[PDB]
Amino acid sequence: FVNQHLCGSHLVEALYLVCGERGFFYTPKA
Amino acid sequence: GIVEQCCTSICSLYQLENYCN
Ligand SMILES: [Zn+2]
Numbered sequence: 001f002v003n004q005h006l007c008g009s010h011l012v013e014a015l016y017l018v019c020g021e022r023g024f025f026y027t028p029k030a
Numbered sequence: 031g032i033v034e035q036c037c038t039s040i041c042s043l044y045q046l047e048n049y050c051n
Contacts, residue, residue, distance in 0.1 A: 001044070007037035014036075018043055019050035026049070028033040 006014050015024045032049060035041050 001042060003040040003042050004036070005040050011033060011036050014043070015046055015049060018046045023051040024049045025051070026033070027031065029031060 004014065012026055015026060018024075032041065032045065036046075
């Protein structure tokens with residue numbers, strides 16, 4: 001794997017691919 | 031944290047794995 005630069009919805013797509021059916025938490029700073 | 035870091039800098043898939051359930 002390679003390092004990635006992910007912003008916005010593109011990070012949520014990556015999380016979806018990595019975690020799949022385990023699911024995930026998307027927790028941005030406030 | 032992860033959100034910011036991936037966008038401001040760079041992040042790896044292994045880092046993202048810390049966010050799976
Ligand atoms: Zn885009």
